[PDB]
């Protein structure tokens, strides 16, 4: 249950749909388990326990696969040593094509349910 958490290196990410600032598996799940969303719906959030770290929550037939997004010291973000990206952008822009290793291929970014206030972007 989240209200409004935001704060990442690239403020621009705030516009990204799959991006949900810093939320908990619970908040992210409810979003994935949603109806409108189907197998493929993904969303990255900022680890709660630790700062900076991210988590890629993807939906696969009602199931939420939590993928720990690790970061390097020379690169940026990477879900699998096999491949590495620079920003959350190129992170999804790639997989979106194929699910190399991933249980499922990223189809579309999760939705953004409004809790308090109108919509904007």
From TrEMBL:
<protein>
    <recommendedName>
        <fullName>Tyrosine-protein kinase</fullName>
    </recommendedName>
</protein>
<feature type="domain" description="SH2">
    <location>
        <begin position="18"/>
        <end position="110"/>
    </location>
</feature>
<comment type="similarity">
    <text>Belongs to the protein kinase superfamily. Tyr protein kinase family.</text>
</comment>
């Amino acid at each position: 249950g989240s209200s409004g958490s935001s704060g990442a290196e690239d403020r621009s990410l705030q516009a990204e749909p799959w991006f949900f600032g810093a939320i908990k598996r619970a908040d992210a799940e409810k979003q994935l388990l949603y109806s409108e969303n189907q197998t493929g719906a993904f969303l990255i959030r900022e680890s709660e326990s630790q700062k900076g770290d991210f988590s890629l929550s993807v939906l696969d037939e009602g199931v939420v696969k939590h993928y720990r997004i690790r970061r390097l010291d020379e690169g940026g973000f990477f879900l699998t040593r096999r491949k590495v990206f620079s920003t959350l952008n190129e992170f999804v822009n790639y997989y979106t094509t194929t699910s190399d290793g991933l249980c499922v291929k990223l189809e579309k970014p999760c939705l953004k349910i409004q809790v308090s206030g109108p919509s904007s972007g």
